[PDB]
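Problem statement: downstream parser choked on a complex file, so we are re-checking the raw output for the adenosine-5'-triphosphate run. The parser issue turned out to be on our end (a line-ending mismatch), but while we're here, posting the original submission so the record is complete.
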Amino acid sequence: FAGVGERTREGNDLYREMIESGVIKLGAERGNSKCTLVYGQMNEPPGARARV
Amino acid sequence: LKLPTAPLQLSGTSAQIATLLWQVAAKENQLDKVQDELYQFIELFKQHSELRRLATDPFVPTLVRTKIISSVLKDSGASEITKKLFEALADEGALSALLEVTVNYEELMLAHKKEVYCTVITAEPLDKLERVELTKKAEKFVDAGFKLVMQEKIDKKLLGGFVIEFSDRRVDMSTAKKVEEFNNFVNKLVLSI
Amino acid sequence: PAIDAGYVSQVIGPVVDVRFDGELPSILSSLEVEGHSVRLVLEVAQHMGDNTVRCIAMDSTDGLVRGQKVVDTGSPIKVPVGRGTLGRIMNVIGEPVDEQGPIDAADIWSIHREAPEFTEQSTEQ
Amino acid sequence: GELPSILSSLEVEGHSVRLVLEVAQHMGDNTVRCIAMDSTDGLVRGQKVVDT
Amino acid sequence: ADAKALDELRKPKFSSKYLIQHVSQKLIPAVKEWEKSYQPPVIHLGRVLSVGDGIARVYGLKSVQAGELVCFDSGVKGMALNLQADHVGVVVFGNDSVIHQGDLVYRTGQIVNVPIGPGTLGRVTDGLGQPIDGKGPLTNVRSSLVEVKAPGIIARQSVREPLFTGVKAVDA
Amino acid sequence: EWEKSYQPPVIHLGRVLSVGDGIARVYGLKSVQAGELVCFDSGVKGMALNLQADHVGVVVFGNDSVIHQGDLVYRTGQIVNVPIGPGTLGRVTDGLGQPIDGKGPLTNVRSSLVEVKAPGIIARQSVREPLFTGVKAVDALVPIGRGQRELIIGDRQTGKTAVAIDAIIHQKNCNEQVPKAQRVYCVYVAVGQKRSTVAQLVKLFTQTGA
Amino acid sequence: KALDELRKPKFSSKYLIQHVSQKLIPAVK
Ligand SMILES: Nc1ncnc2c1ncn2[C@@H]1O[C@H](COP(=O)(O)OP(=O)(O)OP(=O)(O)O)[C@@H](O)[C@H]1O
Ligand SMILES: [Mg+2]
């Protein structure tokens, strides 16, 4: 999931609901995760949103 | 009126001041007299901060900036054309255009001096007949009475011949170029038949 | 120390001009700004012409002074890839923003590359 | 000398009608840019202008 | 008009100095004759080149930060918007009629900030934190930046608490 | 005869002043032609478009990130040309001649300029013989003759390339039944599309045989 | 180096040559 210029609230919601779905597993079970998140949300400057 | 021709045509607004400074110093025959006192002012801007404050500071008055200039150029190496220049370059705050107008003055000068700063790259260091007949070979790439000085270098990936570097133009009379162009020719021509 | 360290010539919002005394960096190379409050990374966009590169800043440029040392990294923005990036959050330049420690990178890949060729196109629906 | 402030009124010395200029901005190099309250026809470059 | 053909003009190449020591002994009396016509030179302060439309272009200010609150000698405050190679573009927090070409611009050393704290509670401030209600300056307060970055993903949580607005249509 | 008269051709150089956004401004190249192909020392090609008195505006045929300030630009002396001939049939070439289908170099082919003056009034004759699209909405109501420009204009996802695809597929259906003279050899120029889109079209043109 | 401020000249007039041409061609005798 690449978040390019969106709400940081939505990124936090997606992270916390991918944890409790088991798609993101925290800690020593990190290798059994199925999703990586990259986030350049709308509070970032225009150089960070143009490259994320 | 009339004016002598410039040796080479060149750029605008700082290289046309230098063309005109060359075009009035060619009439007064002090062509190399204006050139060294152009180099003196560049040295004058180096060691005087109050002289380059008359070129970079926007807050100096345009009357103060032109009165210091005339009150230091009083009949000592004045030449009347680098003295009437510097009023005209302090009348408009263009004293900062001096590092740009002397560079264009120099390239107008060696075109008058008929010298071209060449460079030759040869495969092995030269003999004194290789040098002489290479020199006679190289005057076909300067179409005047132009003298060449050389800066002879060594490249063993040339297989003989030479590569002339005119710093705006390159002539590759080397034989590595000749065998690769020969191979391109014969590998193209057998596809044609 | 001197060459391959340019200095901030001018700052115009997110656009920073850096002046290199010699050995200008390539376009798309990343430059690090030393002496900033946070990690400021500049990606080179243009070569302006008088030994000046023109850069885009990955962070905010507030606090940039027109003499600041800018260090070339000789490579684009390169981010940790691999299976070790799974279950992590990364920002644009690849720093982990999940407070889960560093990222176990299998490789560190440049974010700039070319599209796969016409020979490598899969056409199956 | 010293420049007039922005929105200051300037009077033009010698003109068929009293010409009042109002200073709009400072252009730099000791120049103000003004807007005229009457016609500027017959105005010469170098006419004396009195700041009020 | 090359650059390597201009750096070669840094080294001396004249070998004839009949004008260097002609003017080097005549420059200082000339500068002393026109001395009260000089504004004092400015490097770490600033001087207004041109002001207009609410944007002042400021010469000098060699060490201002981008986005830094500068101060004009009129008292009106600015913000160093774009730092350029020769000037600084300043947006003027106030009326630009009190700014003239030649005015000294003083750098305050801090990115644009406003007073925050418990003592700003109750008060009517202007857009820059200066109080306009007439009941004094802001006491029990501290200055903080106006352009701080928002908190990230890991510094947040979901909203849980209900913040009643008192409007029936809205809160229902 | 070649090594008999072999003139060591002169190469003119130019330094890159500024480069960015796929434009390189180049100092020098005093004899470069307008529209002439130039060559950067990073191997990428160029075309001289803005001949100004101080620089040359060169558009870059590729990625400009491999060009720096002060790189060498060699003029090639030639206007932009492409390999034309019968060796281009079946080959998927890029924006100027060079093949991208991974099937080797273009054999049986010849260079020719891309900006040619169009044939004049004496060079024409009247459009009389039909080109069959195979689309019967077209061939009935909007008939098309050989030598006519017919615009396929429309909104976003309509049948625009589908009419164009069917006209190419139908020529393969007609070239097998007519003599050698009246056969139509198609060219599909795919500007600004995806590589995925054109890989579905070479897959389609190989499957039908077109 | 201290002459990089004289590296870039900047002019207040496009017709700068018309003043130096009025001050140099009457400066030849
Ligand atoms: N004659 C037809 N009958 C049925 N379906 C069609 C016909 N022509 C086109 N389509 C369908 O319509 C869609 C659009 O066709 P086409 O590829 O021609 O679009 P286009 O105009 O090129 O659009 P774009 O320019 O966006 O690619 C295609 O998916 C195709 O399957
Ligand atoms: Mg289409």
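For whoever reads this later: Chains B and C do not touch (no CB pair under 8 Å).
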